[PDB]
Amino acid sequence: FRAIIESPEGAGHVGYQYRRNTGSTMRMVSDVLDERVSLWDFHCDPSGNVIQPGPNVDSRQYLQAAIDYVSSNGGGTITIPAGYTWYLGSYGVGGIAGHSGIIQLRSNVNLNIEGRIHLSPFFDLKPFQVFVGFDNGDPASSGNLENCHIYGHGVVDFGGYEFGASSQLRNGVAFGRSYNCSVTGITFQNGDVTWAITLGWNGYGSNCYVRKCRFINLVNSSVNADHSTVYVNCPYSGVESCYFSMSSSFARNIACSVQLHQHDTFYRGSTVNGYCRGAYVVMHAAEAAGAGSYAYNMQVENNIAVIYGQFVILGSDVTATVSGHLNDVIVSGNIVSIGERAAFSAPFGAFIDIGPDNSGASNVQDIQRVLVTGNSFYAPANITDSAAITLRANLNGCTFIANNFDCRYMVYNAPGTTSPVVQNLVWDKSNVIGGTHANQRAGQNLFDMQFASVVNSTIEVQLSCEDLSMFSCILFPASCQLSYSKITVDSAWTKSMSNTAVFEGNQQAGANVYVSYPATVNLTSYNTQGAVPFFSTDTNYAWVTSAYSLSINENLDFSPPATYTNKANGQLVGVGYNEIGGVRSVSVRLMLQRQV
Amino acid sequence: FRAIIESPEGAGHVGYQYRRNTGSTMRMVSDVLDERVSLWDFHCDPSGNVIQPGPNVDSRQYLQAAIDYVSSNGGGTITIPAGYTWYLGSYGVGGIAGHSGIIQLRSNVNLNIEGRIHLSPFFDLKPFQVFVGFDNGDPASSGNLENCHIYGHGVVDFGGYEFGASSQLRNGVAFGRSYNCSVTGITFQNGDVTWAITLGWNGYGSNCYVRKCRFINLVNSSVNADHSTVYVNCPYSGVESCYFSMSSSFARNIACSVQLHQHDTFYRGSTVNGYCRGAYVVMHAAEAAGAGSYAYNMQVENNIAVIYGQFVILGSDVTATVSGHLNDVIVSGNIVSIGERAAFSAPFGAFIDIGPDNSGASNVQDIQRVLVTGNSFYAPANITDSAAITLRANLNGCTFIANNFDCRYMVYNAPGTTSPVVQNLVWDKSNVIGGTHANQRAGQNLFDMQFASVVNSTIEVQLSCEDLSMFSCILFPASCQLSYSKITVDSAWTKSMSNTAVFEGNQQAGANVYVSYPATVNLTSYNTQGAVPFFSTDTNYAWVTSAYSLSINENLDFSPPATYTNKANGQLVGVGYNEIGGVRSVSVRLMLQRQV
Amino acid sequence: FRAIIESPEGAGHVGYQYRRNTGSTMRMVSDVLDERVSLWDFHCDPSGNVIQPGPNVDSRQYLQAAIDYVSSNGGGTITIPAGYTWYLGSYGVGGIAGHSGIIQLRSNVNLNIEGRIHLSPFFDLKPFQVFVGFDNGDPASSGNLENCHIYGHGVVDFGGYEFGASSQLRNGVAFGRSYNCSVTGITFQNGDVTWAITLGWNGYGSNCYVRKCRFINLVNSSVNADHSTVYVNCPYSGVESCYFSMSSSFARNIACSVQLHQHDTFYRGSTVNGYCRGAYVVMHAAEAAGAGSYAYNMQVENNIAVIYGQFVILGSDVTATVSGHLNDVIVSGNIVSIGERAAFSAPFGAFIDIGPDNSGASNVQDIQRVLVTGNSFYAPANITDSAAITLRANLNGCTFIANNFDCRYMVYNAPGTTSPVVQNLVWDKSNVIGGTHANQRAGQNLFDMQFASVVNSTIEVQLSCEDLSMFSCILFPASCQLSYSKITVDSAWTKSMSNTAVFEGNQQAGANVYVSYPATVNLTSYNTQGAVPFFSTDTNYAWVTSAYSLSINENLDFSPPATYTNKANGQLVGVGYNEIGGVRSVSVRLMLQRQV
């Protein structure tokens, strides 16, 4: 009996019944212990003696054996024990080798990481993906990963190692073709990686989530080509209540927190500091296989960010046989700033960027039905390169309502670069334009409409303080066609501006252009006593449907007209009043109106 | 000794002290095992031998025995083990039998569902409620359920069985008169049910929540009368970060994701696909016993939905002795579309519906202080039956600010049906009206004001592109009284519209109606050289307080007035200028204004 | 052998191998039991015999021994078992004694509270902090607490004891200088305390969170000086999805739910009932040591509240050597009401308060770049003391867009109290002003601008129903300077108001003041037949740049001007038309405009 009890089957001979309940199962101790499983149950030598983890022990084969075994019983949760650091020091074998994989995840096998998982110096200057849910080196030939959850209070530490070559890839968790998989509570830290977590593969997958995770210092070298902390490449998936922080200079130029690349995906309630970019919201044609060629129902909400480049980047593109489309997007409730930096020292600061494709093409995009509402954006006064929207590629629609934008430009695109075709750009009057950059705008147009064309668009400019340094509130170069559009500049804070709206090709004269803006106009009257006409000296008002006075009348003996219409020769005309006769000459501030 | 050790009391004779710590308790192994409990501890035959679960084993009595026992010790958490499917194959007995109950929940007894719970074919064509927290067949005589949490990565599978009769009810979890109860992480799938989860009973309960659950394919037949996935019938309760999906045709006509039926309830951060409706926000008088007759502090925020009918339905109603009231509601940050379907093939598409009671009555409602803000709504161009709001019952107030609505109608109610009494409907100018349905609106009014009366309301219409197909921007039939209201149509994109605002009963003449809209007006002048009057040929402008030109003047020799007032006979009059004399005749586009 | 097996080392001699897997570790039963730990492992007498908890057992030393031991092994999670109430009945010793501490938390040692922790009557009329993460009585000399998480379905019950003296402090969890610490799922109840949870210390700490907790009845006496349920005093931290309830009268006068006192902090998705205040958003100079002197990236979103005082209070202040600054704040998506109460029976009702410092100073604040958007606020009609914003201290900027405010005042400050200096106050026209207080406003100004000065501000007043009881829509006393500002009153619902905008110092005449509002004006014409001038009888319009008719013309034989300008003597003048000659005299409602 002593032999049996001291043997590995001993617990299988000690009887147990829950709480001495006579109605409970008559079990053995081993049965109850078998209800849970930990890395300790596989972390042993060939004789079955436990091995202590440590920097000189490679725990990989043992964790893999645990996963393989639990998988074979239909699943369960393997605990990675608290109070220990478990080092990984070799590559996995088989289907994950094509992904530089360390551990292969399996369906229905959850990992409760309570301790620490650390990469050993074997991985220095090498590629790696720590956990991989693909089962084949070719993702198109891979099976699915289902019902795999990684959670706990533990840590994945990437060892601080730099990339060896820019062409290498590194990742924390690649769920693969992933259905009902998640990471919750985990801290990913101290690395130079491409991604921390990737969900899905080219639209294959569903219901994958990253929640309450921390991502700290995951870019550290000039070799790192690019970094996006979470890449969401399956629909009905997203990122919620996470924390993302970088301290490296390199991160300010290369790092983004999230990629939302399939329909019905979201990024909410998260805090970002030290990154270049917040989130891309994109449909890549090359990623359209599993869920279609449309990214729709895309949500970026209630995030807090300090970034150095752009908050949300919108795009779509094409391959030889597939066209990507982006539509039905909402960006709301976010509070975002460009961190302290010199002008032009990081990628151009923006709340929204309409980004050209990876080859720089600006004529492949199909982006529409986007609502940007209830956000606040701030950039310090010295940051010349800061805009509410950098509109750098073709845009089929974007709507701004009730935001507060406090930066250098509202709408911007650089002259002599791309010439976007713009449709359905709507900037509602409820967007509040801050004053941080007042007096910084010499030579600059607040809305700098450097486009090929603008149609079906609305720009309602409302200032909230004076900035007499700017060249204009809104400027259209002669190369920009403008039609079926409404462009207004409210008069408040504009009395002393030389230029308010500027149409360098006289585009405001278009049949279906609806415009109003302030201007200074010189008038002269006829001599007649009584009701008497006043006429503008200049003849550039053939497009004006009505105008009205924004100036007081300092005179007693006469008054100019309150309101004006035009004449065929381009003069304004109105009827004033001469109490006493005489030719009058006045300079008046008018609101010029066309069809409004 | 061998006898004792091999007996069910054996573990109670093997000593243990935590980590050989001399300061720790000297325990027995059974004491430590007794800290946890699983279904295995009760899933046994009358001799105490464990029984394997499977499709031919009814696990119900064993799970019930586990719950009953743990309850008797003041509570705890019972694990339903991973790697097994536990089938239920009979009805429960006692107080839950009146609810077609399977398992009776008890207070302080949590269920950690890691494996799968599946209904056996016993339940085919039958009613059932899988988990029931009532302790009496009459809910009014039931005790409370407190501190009961169901959570884990597991699954409740309803076996795919159709309803046997439309009058049957099916549910997953009915917490009952439930205080501090929740479901977290669970997947409910593969059924034809009435509800997945119900919280509370007629206002009795508090602090009940559904979080991070999935609801997949829970309607599958034409027999199913109605489906709402979660019914929230207790205050201080709600649904967060859930996923709801249906694939059946029937679901598009009958299924809603959530009912919010008591005060201080919420629905946030969730994704819905394949349903008829998003959420009802309702006070039923028949449900007012536990928490009063007011549903207030109701929140529907930051959800993503593809539906076929209406997103949010508002209502309240009465019984013989109780009147229900709905107020203090916020609907914000949601992105919603009507999915691809033929016009009129599902219930009328809407973002907000003001829904008549279950008997069709439209004169029992008391709905006010609702804020709908920062949402986006889209319906494909062919969907005639799509509206920002279908206003089908009496409304005491609803406020729309800063939404983007891209569908056929803005405000709609069908003529020849109900005649709501409308008060305090506010449609702010910051609502952006999309252009998807441009050119589809022959014979249709964008705001079709088919009401008995409208008072204290604001409609500020702002187009963002042309749609010359529509009959009018806004139309009031002669049967609709209109008073103490502001109705404006911005001129942008309206120059070529025959009708902008239409008042078929000349209601715009009311003493406290404030209106402005564009119109085309024919004028003739007197012969006089110099300042000269122009008068309208028609006499239907007795209500106009001022008008101004929206047209250019192609003439050199004269100009019509910039601005006009009226005369007692209903003509417009203004003072223009004849450089040379002559009777003039012009047709001008004017902004007509009344009291604005 | 029997001796060994019955001894505390017995489990260390019974062999086990997971699921009889020949590839698994050959362990002993004690090894597997050692993977978990509970209070039972330390809750024993000096001979190692287990002690049952209860109201006459002080569990403190045992829980402390458990924490101290697990800490020494590098951490883990200690379960506090379900089905038992564990009483605490003495103070801790050492570093926590200076904090009236009971239990000392240690790094990496989590507490899974499943049962109940209750304070014994030892603590009646005494100070206490139940769990303390400081390790020194002087916080400036304390070490850090890291990686400490408290979670579960359990309860902390404060025994209902009143404070003994107002100067005492009581707390539930003081994490201290806390990095990666959290409380999740716990119910804190039945107390008279200062705080339930405090995060951080004077800016030291990071990544601390309170999620899914309940706070119920934590103020019960007149002795309690002040209460804030969660104080967030470290950056990158916040409160999400919590429930806060009070029933005591005292709570309505003293209690706030949250303090956000460091940068990158948030309060979201929570429900509050019975409190005085929602949240303070503040930078105290005295708290600036660990994270700097700026509170920025502050977020209060998507909360539901019934309160009696103010929802969000903004402030910053100074010490002898440090100045605090508050900027980059967003308050969005909240639905808030003042609960039923008599006027003036609790602190002044407000959605936003700009609060003077703790000494009452209103000239130390530096608050700017605040966005308040998409919120709804309601106060019952009798509550005179209710305002969208009580602006009681110096303000450098606050922006309101797309809110719905239904209360007595929009902007308020009490006359004869503080005289704030106001800059960059922006009230967009998209704010909807409710009608609950219509007819209650005798003697009152809707926007009561009781300030020293206002600059760079925008107030666009838009009514949505009539209230002829109010004295004015907006009033500036003569003591308030006004410059570089835009003040407009839309005409809708204003026709019968005697006063719309009132400038008691004629401030609207300022060179850079842009204003428009309705007024009634008496005019007389000259006798001349034909085009004929009309002039105002009064001479107080020297500041008017244009005016236009808001009245119809009941006359046939003449018409007054549609539009007017002014003259040097302060008369309005315009050109009307006398079909037949005669001196005319009319009273007209005009929109008066200055520079707009």
Ligand SMILES: CC(=O)N[C@@H]1[C@H]2O[C@]3(O[C@H]4[C@H](O)[C@@H](CO[C@@]5(OC[C@@H](O[C@H]1O)[C@H]2O)O[C@H](CO)[C@@H](O)[C@H](O)[C@H]5O)O[C@H](O)[C@@H]4NC(C)=O)O[C@H](CO)[C@H](O[C@H]1O[C@H](CO[C@@H]2O[C@@H](C)[C@H](O)[C@@H](O)[C@H]2O)[C@@H](O)[C@H](O)[C@H]1O)[C@H](O[C@@H]1O[C@H](CO)[C@@H](O)[C@H](O)[C@H]1NC(C)=O)[C@H]3O
């Ligand atoms: C499936 C569902 O919940 N449908 C919703 C309707 O519920 C009733 O619920 C329907 C609601 O009335 C409407 C609200 O819109 C209408 O909109 C609300 C209706 O929406 C359906 O989605 C609900 O009434 O009214 C609005 C206000 O006037 C108006 O604006 C709008 O335009 C209208 O359309 O929304 C849904 O459609 C609701 N439907 C569902 C499926 O939730 O109809 C239900 C049909 O299933 C259900 O009635 C049945 O069940 C009750 C309850 O069953 C008894 O009690 C329980 C406790 C025991 O366990 C059972 O064994 C049984 O004894 C039966 O009495 C009734 O005869 C059945 O037809 C809804 O009942 C409520 O169910 C909840 C959840 O279980 C209970 O907590 C609550 O006590 C029940 N309320 C009442 C009054 O009985 C019923 O409200």
Ligand SMILES: CC(=O)N[C@@H]1[C@H]2O[C@]3(O[C@H]4[C@H](O)[C@@H](CO[C@@]5(OC[C@@H](O[C@H]1O)[C@H]2O)O[C@H](CO)[C@@H](O)[C@H](O)[C@H]5O)O[C@H](O)[C@@H]4NC(C)=O)O[C@H](CO)[C@H](O[C@H]1O[C@H](CO[C@@H]2O[C@@H](C)[C@H](O)[C@@H](O)[C@H]2O)[C@@H](O)[C@H](O)[C@H]1O)[C@H](O[C@@H]1O[C@H](CO)[C@@H](O)[C@H](O)[C@H]1NC(C)=O)[C@H]3O
């Ligand atoms: C109960 C509470 O937190 N009240 C809030 C006030 O806190 C002080 O906190 C109050 C805040 O000052 C005000 C802010 O609004 C006012 O608004 C802020 C005040 O709001 C109360 O709600 C807080 O100061 O100032 C604004 C800015 O100028 C202005 O806009 C506004 O109009 C003003 O009204 O908000 C609340 O009212 C705060 N009150 C509460 C209860 O949080 O007052 C507190 C009273 O309890 C408290 O002071 C006491 O406690 C400190 C701390 O105790 C020592 O240190 C700790 C670490 C040890 O454990 C203890 O044993 C003890 O040695 C005592 O020094 C002091 O003498 C007591 O009166 C607040 O102190 C801060 O407590 C937090 C949380 O524990 C600490 O992390 C922090 O270090 C403390 N800060 C300071 C400067 O001591 C105090 O700020």
Ligand code: NA
């Ligand atoms: Na590869």
Ligand code: NA
């Ligand atoms: Na890139």
Ligand code: NA
């Ligand atoms: Na990137």
Ligand code: NA
């Ligand atoms: Na029943």
Ligand code: NA
């Ligand atoms: Na129904």
Ligand code: NA
């Ligand atoms: Na329904």
Ligand code: NA
């Ligand atoms: Na102290």
Ligand code: NA
């Ligand atoms: Na205080």
Ligand code: NA
């Ligand atoms: Na307080």
